[PDB]
Amino acid sequence: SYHKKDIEGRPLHPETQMMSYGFDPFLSEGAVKPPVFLTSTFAFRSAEDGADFFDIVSGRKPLRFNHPNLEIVEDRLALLDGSEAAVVTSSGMSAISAIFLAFLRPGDQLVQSVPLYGGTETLIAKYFREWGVGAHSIDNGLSPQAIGAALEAAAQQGPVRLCYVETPANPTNALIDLDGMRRELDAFEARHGYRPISVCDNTLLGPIFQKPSEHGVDMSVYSLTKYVGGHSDLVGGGVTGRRDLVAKVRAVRSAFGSQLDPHSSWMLIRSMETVVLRMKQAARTASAVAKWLATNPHQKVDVYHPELIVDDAYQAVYKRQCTGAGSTFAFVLNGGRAEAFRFINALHLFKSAVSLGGTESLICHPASTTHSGVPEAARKAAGVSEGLIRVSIGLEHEEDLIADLDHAFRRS
Amino acid sequence: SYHKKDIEGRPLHPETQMMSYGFDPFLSEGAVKPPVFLTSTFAFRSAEDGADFFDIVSGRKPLSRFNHPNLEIVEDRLALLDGSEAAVVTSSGMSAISAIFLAFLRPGDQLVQSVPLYGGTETLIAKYFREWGVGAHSIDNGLSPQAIGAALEAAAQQGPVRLCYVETPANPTNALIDLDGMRRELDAFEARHGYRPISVCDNTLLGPIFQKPSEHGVDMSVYSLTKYVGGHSDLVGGGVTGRRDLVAKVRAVRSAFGSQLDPHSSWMLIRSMETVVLRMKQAARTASAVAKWLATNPHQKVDVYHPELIVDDAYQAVYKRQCTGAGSTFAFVLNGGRAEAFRFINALHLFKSAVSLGGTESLICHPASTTHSGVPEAARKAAGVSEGLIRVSIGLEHEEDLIADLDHAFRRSG
Amino acid sequence: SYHKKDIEGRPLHPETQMMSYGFDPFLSEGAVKPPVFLTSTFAFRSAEDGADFFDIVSGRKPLSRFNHPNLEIVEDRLALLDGSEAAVVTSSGMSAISAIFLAFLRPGDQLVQSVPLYGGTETLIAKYFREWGVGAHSIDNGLSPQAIGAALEAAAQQGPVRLCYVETPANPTNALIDLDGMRRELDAFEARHGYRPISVCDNTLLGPIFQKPSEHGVDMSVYSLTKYVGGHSDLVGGGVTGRRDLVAKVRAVRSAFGSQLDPHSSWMLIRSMETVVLRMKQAARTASAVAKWLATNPHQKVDVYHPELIVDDAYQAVYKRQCTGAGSTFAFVLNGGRAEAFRFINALHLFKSAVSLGGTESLICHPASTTHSGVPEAARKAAGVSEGLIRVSIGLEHEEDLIADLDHAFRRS
Amino acid sequence: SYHKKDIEGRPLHPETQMMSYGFDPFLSEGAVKPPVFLTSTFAFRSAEDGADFFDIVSGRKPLPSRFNHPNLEIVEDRLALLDGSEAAVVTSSGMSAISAIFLAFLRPGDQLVQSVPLYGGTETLIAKYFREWGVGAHSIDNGLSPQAIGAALEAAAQQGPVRLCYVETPANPTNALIDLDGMRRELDAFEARHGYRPISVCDNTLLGPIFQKPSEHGVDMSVYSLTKYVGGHSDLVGGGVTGRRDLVAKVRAVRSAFGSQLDPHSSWMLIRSMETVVLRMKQAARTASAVAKWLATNPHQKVDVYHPELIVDDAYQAVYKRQCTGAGSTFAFVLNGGRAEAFRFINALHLFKSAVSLGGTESLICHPASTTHSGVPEAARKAAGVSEGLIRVSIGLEHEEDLIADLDHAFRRS
């Protein structure tokens, strides 16, 4: 009755749902917003209840087991991206970690797209590699044959437990073909008799502009720190997808103590009331700023924004799995680090930081920050050049952001 | 340097300013958002500094340590949003209105008021300050400059006219007060009497985005930040904007009566104001479409008291010159009475039954049995409150869903 | 069932009640602490439900929907701490005091006051409410029932005596008002004039743990919860406790003038009250030791205005009768006037130089140039606030560290 | 200057340090308490600053704090000060702190030595999750016997590298002890025989940081559930790891890689909590002694009381006298009537809350065999002294006469 998804047959819009879904005000004194349970300690009505509770939590008896504020966030997040279930954690990285800890074992192999968020690559290549997990890279995320080849290469060395992709990629907005990935995992399953669990890091576009569950992806992972929170003021992670898989992640979250805290949960609920509004606004502005960059009167720059990438295969994937371009993109100045540094330092409205998806616009130079630990050769092959600048557009007016970039070109 | 109003000469848009104006990250270790000072106790660097501090605060020596850091940011941004010189924020809309009354009224003073006012303001005037010796005089017709002058003259017959307090648009009919005509009548009053009543506008329904009384010579605006500016039906807060010297007297009262906003709510306000432009324009967009749909719905003809649907010539001339949008709170009148209104409201799924307004969620109420049930029938008539009138305050939900909910209500109550 | 005041017939101690009184965990999903309602907007289940609510608010139908959930717990516990029938919390100490003056004063009314008062209170009386037509009359000697009766008589010469407003112990001298004698003087006043002034005690310095004015017939107590009850110099709030009918009138003013405490601060207050007994007794213990060391310090003979060190007979009989501890705020007087007092305060490293009191950290200030610099010099001097006087408010630091800090200040000054 | 540890030569007491250590008010506008940075995003003053930052963050250039959140840093300085450690890192929970230690040091094939019984959550991490990643565990039979500690180390080394010696003392719920000095000497002898040294880790939640400082006894690292005594108000979740700088640095790197930092708001609550941690832990300990003494002599039923002050054994008391300066406030007592009697007793209480946490302001009670220790097999449970009649209480700040009256009522109704 408080999980109503439709009205007279037509489904409700997400922005409507984020004000009530999963919360019954009259079970909380009529409060129109959910109260914050700033505690993790809930007492039992009896010792018999306490024993009964632990019988169920442990599985000694078949199925109160969720924090009230986390449950509302999880219900609303899964609704936003079309998933059966969701679990929220203390951070994007602890959400990704819980997935790896839930499913990987020594001897396991995983397939990954390239490039991944640096912290994810660190978990795979440093920590889990040392725990006996092998990783195999997809050569070209737009080539289904390359996805299948990576799956076969992984299967040669052990069980392929996970197929973990991140699309669009940072900072070039390169894409992974989700439908092609699903079909390659279907053929793999037909050949080997088991199916790798598919996971998509959906932070850049989701949950509003991309829903991996609509493309057969088993789980999506989010750094709620970015767009969903959207105010650069809370850290949180989320995992959405099929109920049985999310249940294993929830078990790991509880075992490794990775729960999101109640106060941040209250901020997330507040944030989710404007997530539709904020993400569409930021994307509209970023679209305008990108088009202005692509034809600016100062200096020819390459603009790696999804609407400006002309390749046929790219656009076929984009049209099929994305409903907007997000608000994070990069452009490439002529010249190297020196020009990019002078450009960034001339801006007044973009703040120099490595985060993304805030109410304020952010800017950084990946080669000297997010990607400074990668060798210069591997940066160049990944398209991260010394002239590349990444912006994450916020809620400022497009005319002010454009005027800010205009001033930077002149003063550089 | 932390108060930049323009870029290469052109002024920055308000939505751009709400992410930086009045805050320098590098005086707070680069934090891109202001830290929260959850304290009101700030130590002195020396006993001499403390003595110097109290010398200045009291006026013993002529002149920001005199403002809480988080309140200062909210006030700078709020004044920027509505074009004012200065602002002071309080614990609530009612304590902001109170501070204005306490700062300027004295025994024997008279005030001019528009009608109807928020119930809480009317209680302050008619119960508390009347007992303290303040007389009030009502404007008969807020669209008539002659009626404004007459109320001012009637007030001046009884004593000094200290305040001219108006509220536009009015709740629940969205009736208007002609702010430019009030300015001209106050100009003529000042020419005749040699003093000028301070003018104040409760700007909660439309401000600060869709109406800026300071652009019309109104001395001060007062706001319930609890409504639109906060916008998420959590924090409670008030704001007063206007001329710096008047705001300073209001600020002095705020300190003496201890009605400062708390820091945690200030941090919530700062967060809210990062989306206030977007939220208010979206809510107004949906309300305009919902109002237009009500006006031609196929179930039953209803009067719709939304500013864009009120055809009177004088009203529209006032609306066009002092408003840039219609807000998102409006009323419509069903045929029949309380019984039909109750069946309509109870059939809705997306509107919550509450008396607040300007939240992210859409709200609905029946004023005759709630907000205006304690007033005599005469006061209901003067506010346009009949038993069939229903007031909605549109939130951020999609207009197609709100319309479907209202369409369903007509069918299930008809 | 959740307002249980005793166990096996015997009443529960206050520190026990601060962990449960007025809260049923099983009405909140078993949560052992009350959830925070960060909203003031509560919806009705139906349009009829809304009409019924306002029927009750307006008195058309006789009568918790009429209180915020977190403020109600704070108020229940606060009234419990000081033995009052009822309580109402506001945004600040000053808005709580204001609510009292706005609830009861009218043009022409007179009030009786003790001296000295908190500076902010003195400003409300002598500036704002005087301009609204209220006169004030001072008790010359708070230990003298004759002086209390005299002020009441002087007040009635000019108009109705609506309030008898006292603050005991006084800030910063710890001067006392004889509360039992005040009640008896008001009884005799009522016999002569046929009406009784409402008595109010600002109970911030000692309450609610070390003094309960309701046990001495005081009609209302007012608190700056910003001080001891909050105790962490991180929230601002006020409270009024006392007779149910009087608190109800203050509450109506609180709502009409928009002085509600916010929910987040209410949650912090609930958290704070779980240690208010513990914190106030610790600070009081430490202050006794620090005052005793000051009274015999090895550097300079100084007068110490701490309740345990003021030897006067009338003082101690009043103190023993109405106080169960001495608090942690007190003053001492240097010989070197303002110049030496400034050198002393500036040499300290552990006491923070600030005007607040009753925090976890120890505080120090010079009242003649700060807290009481707004009072005319004559009234300041006549109340014992002298240029050499230094006020300390002891926190939770170890007494040996505070003494070492004061010892260093004597040397470096 | 903001990290001053002494005054005129004598070191400041911990309750004094918890109000100032690691914070300079005049770098925060005189605020007497630290402001809350409710953000993790800190901007660079220049592109060159950003490149320099990552030069250091990656270890390409050494540090010449920009690399710690302001509020977490104050908590970490104060925690390390309280327990005498060189360094500290705080995480989102006790379990994420314990996990970070395991993830920083364990590899497939590694062995660890553990005390018994451990917290149920720790036992699950070892026996389920890290067992499946290839880690073996070996239990110390008698924590008071140095021979038993060395035997466990030798047994572990037969099967692979002994990476960790992980103990929890006093143990939950029996208050059984690990001889920490004897453990250090056994690790010395182990190191002499094998040429490598397991890292020693002590879960110090029940007594620390006030009543036990493992760093004073050669323990390499302590781990805390700050959720219990340090927070102390049953309203925040947090973990802490303290110890040697090089080891904490490796734990900190794991914390960052696995995203388990504590959030800013909980850090601000922790700072507030630590201002009363000495007062609260000493008070709870006083009450616990009085309640335990009353239980040992109650007129209703002879019960065994497992409170450190009531355990008469010579070896136990020598260990306790040497490494503890107090008994904490969590302890157990054993009824005769097994689970059925334990349940009737617990259900009869009015002031103790039936819950599994410990170290709150409210006193708590639970039955470990069916709750906290129900996930460990019954054989391992029974050998660790967790029996069907055992009841665990955690004393809070209530007055002892009220808790005693409450337990008295429970005995009668049973």
PDB file of C-alpha atoms in Angstrom, chain A residues 301-395:
ATOM      1  CA  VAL A 301      39.638  21.405 -28.875  1.00  0.00           C
ATOM      2  CA  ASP A 302      38.540  17.782 -29.033  1.00  0.00           C
ATOM      3  CA  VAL A 303      35.360  17.319 -26.972  1.00  0.00           C
ATOM      4  CA  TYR A 304      34.685  13.850 -25.500  1.00  0.00           C
ATOM      5  CA  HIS A 305      31.010  14.328 -24.760  1.00  0.00           C
ATOM      6  CA  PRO A 306      28.635  11.550 -25.871  1.00  0.00           C
ATOM      7  CA  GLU A 307      26.630  13.826 -28.161  1.00  0.00           C
ATOM      8  CA  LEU A 308      29.802  14.969 -29.963  1.00  0.00           C
ATOM      9  CA  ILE A 309      31.335  11.527 -30.604  1.00  0.00           C
ATOM     10  CA  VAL A 310      30.511  10.750 -34.246  1.00  0.00           C
ATOM     11  CA  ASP A 311      31.461   7.025 -34.586  1.00  0.00           C
ATOM     12  CA  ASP A 312      28.556   4.876 -35.823  1.00  0.00           C
ATOM     13  CA  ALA A 313      29.146   1.983 -33.407  1.00  0.00           C
ATOM     14  CA  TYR A 314      29.382   4.406 -30.472  1.00  0.00           C
ATOM     15  CA  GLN A 315      26.085   6.135 -31.291  1.00  0.00           C
ATOM     16  CA  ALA A 316      24.285   2.812 -31.843  1.00  0.00           C
ATOM     17  CA  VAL A 317      25.278   1.769 -28.328  1.00  0.00           C
ATOM     18  CA  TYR A 318      24.542   5.221 -26.900  1.00  0.00           C
ATOM     19  CA  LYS A 319      21.073   5.503 -28.459  1.00  0.00           C
ATOM     20  CA  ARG A 320      20.222   1.995 -27.218  1.00  0.00           C
ATOM     21  CA  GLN A 321      21.310   2.028 -23.560  1.00  0.00           C
ATOM     22  CA  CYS A 322      21.490   5.738 -22.556  1.00  0.00           C
ATOM     23  CA  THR A 323      18.714   8.334 -22.287  1.00  0.00           C
ATOM     24  CA  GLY A 324      21.051  11.280 -21.661  1.00  0.00           C
ATOM     25  CA  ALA A 325      24.735  12.135 -21.647  1.00  0.00           C
ATOM     26  CA  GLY A 326      25.230  13.038 -17.977  1.00  0.00           C
ATOM     27  CA  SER A 327      27.218  16.088 -16.981  1.00  0.00           C
ATOM     28  CA  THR A 328      30.826  14.836 -16.770  1.00  0.00           C
ATOM     29  CA  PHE A 329      32.999  15.101 -19.892  1.00  0.00           C
ATOM     30  CA  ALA A 330      36.474  16.052 -21.022  1.00  0.00           C
ATOM     31  CA  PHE A 331      38.061  18.221 -23.695  1.00  0.00           C
ATOM     32  CA  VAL A 332      41.642  18.316 -24.972  1.00  0.00           C
ATOM     33  CA  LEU A 333      43.583  21.539 -25.360  1.00  0.00           C
ATOM     34  CA  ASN A 334      46.384  21.913 -27.828  1.00  0.00           C
ATOM     35  CA  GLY A 335      49.626  21.918 -25.923  1.00  0.00           C
ATOM     36  CA  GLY A 336      50.411  20.000 -22.797  1.00  0.00           C
ATOM     37  CA  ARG A 337      50.220  20.270 -19.033  1.00  0.00           C
ATOM     38  CA  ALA A 338      51.425  23.891 -19.010  1.00  0.00           C
ATOM     39  CA  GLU A 339      48.516  25.164 -21.131  1.00  0.00           C
ATOM     40  CA  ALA A 340      45.985  23.064 -19.210  1.00  0.00           C
ATOM     41  CA  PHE A 341      47.328  24.356 -15.880  1.00  0.00           C
ATOM     42  CA  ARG A 342      47.108  27.979 -17.007  1.00  0.00           C
ATOM     43  CA  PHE A 343      43.577  27.334 -18.268  1.00  0.00           C
ATOM     44  CA  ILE A 344      42.323  25.727 -15.040  1.00  0.00           C
ATOM     45  CA  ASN A 345      43.960  28.399 -12.887  1.00  0.00           C
ATOM     46  CA  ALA A 346      42.134  31.191 -14.761  1.00  0.00           C
ATOM     47  CA  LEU A 347      38.620  29.918 -13.962  1.00  0.00           C
ATOM     48  CA  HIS A 348      36.475  31.472 -11.235  1.00  0.00           C
ATOM     49  CA  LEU A 349      33.362  29.234 -11.174  1.00  0.00           C
ATOM     50  CA  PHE A 350      34.792  25.730 -11.685  1.00  0.00           C
ATOM     51  CA  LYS A 351      36.386  24.436  -8.481  1.00  0.00           C
ATOM     52  CA  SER A 352      39.615  22.401  -8.796  1.00  0.00           C
ATOM     53  CA  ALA A 353      38.835  18.988  -7.333  1.00  0.00           C
ATOM     54  CA  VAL A 354      38.748  15.362  -8.451  1.00  0.00           C
ATOM     55  CA  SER A 355      35.128  14.659  -7.468  1.00  0.00           C
ATOM     56  CA  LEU A 356      32.141  14.806  -9.828  1.00  0.00           C
ATOM     57  CA  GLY A 357      28.375  15.270  -9.869  1.00  0.00           C
ATOM     58  CA  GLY A 358      28.017  18.053  -7.296  1.00  0.00           C
ATOM     59  CA  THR A 359      25.783  21.113  -7.266  1.00  0.00           C
ATOM     60  CA  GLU A 360      28.960  23.132  -7.984  1.00  0.00           C
ATOM     61  CA  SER A 361      30.890  22.595 -11.207  1.00  0.00           C
ATOM     62  CA  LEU A 362      34.263  20.861 -10.824  1.00  0.00           C
ATOM     63  CA  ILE A 363      37.351  20.637 -13.003  1.00  0.00           C
ATOM     64  CA  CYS A 364      40.587  18.688 -12.900  1.00  0.00           C
ATOM     65  CA  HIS A 365      43.534  17.654 -15.066  1.00  0.00           C
ATOM     66  CA  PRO A 366      43.517  13.817 -14.974  1.00  0.00           C
ATOM     67  CA  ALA A 367      47.116  13.258 -16.105  1.00  0.00           C
ATOM     68  CA  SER A 368      48.446  15.037 -12.995  1.00  0.00           C
ATOM     69  CA  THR A 369      45.753  13.863 -10.556  1.00  0.00           C
ATOM     70  CA  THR A 370      43.352  10.941 -11.012  1.00  0.00           C
ATOM     71  CA  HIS A 371      45.684   9.230 -13.529  1.00  0.00           C
ATOM     72  CA  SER A 372      49.098  10.420 -12.277  1.00  0.00           C
ATOM     73  CA  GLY A 373      49.968   6.979 -10.878  1.00  0.00           C
ATOM     74  CA  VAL A 374      49.669   5.316 -14.302  1.00  0.00           C
ATOM     75  CA  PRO A 375      52.828   5.281 -16.478  1.00  0.00           C
ATOM     76  CA  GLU A 376      52.917   7.893 -19.237  1.00  0.00           C
ATOM     77  CA  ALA A 377      52.729   5.142 -21.868  1.00  0.00           C
ATOM     78  CA  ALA A 378      49.564   3.597 -20.389  1.00  0.00           C
ATOM     79  CA  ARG A 379      47.977   7.052 -20.087  1.00  0.00           C
ATOM     80  CA  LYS A 380      48.591   7.767 -23.786  1.00  0.00           C
ATOM     81  CA  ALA A 381      47.118   4.426 -24.878  1.00  0.00           C
ATOM     82  CA  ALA A 382      44.055   5.140 -22.696  1.00  0.00           C
ATOM     83  CA  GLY A 383      43.518   8.574 -24.279  1.00  0.00           C
ATOM     84  CA  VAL A 384      44.503  10.501 -21.133  1.00  0.00           C
ATOM     85  CA  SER A 385      46.855  13.120 -22.580  1.00  0.00           C
ATOM     86  CA  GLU A 386      48.652  16.051 -20.989  1.00  0.00           C
ATOM     87  CA  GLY A 387      46.209  18.484 -22.638  1.00  0.00           C
ATOM     88  CA  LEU A 388      43.041  16.714 -21.453  1.00  0.00           C
ATOM     89  CA  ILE A 389      40.799  18.569 -18.992  1.00  0.00           C
ATOM     90  CA  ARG A 390      37.751  16.966 -17.333  1.00  0.00           C
ATOM     91  CA  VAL A 391      34.739  18.999 -16.202  1.00  0.00           C
ATOM     92  CA  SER A 392      31.762  17.853 -14.141  1.00  0.00           C
ATOM     93  CA  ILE A 393      28.923  20.322 -14.696  1.00  0.00           C
ATOM     94  CA  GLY A 394      26.759  21.353 -11.728  1.00  0.00           C
ATOM     95  CA  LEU A 395      23.654  23.519 -11.466  1.00  0.00           C
TER      96      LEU A 395
END
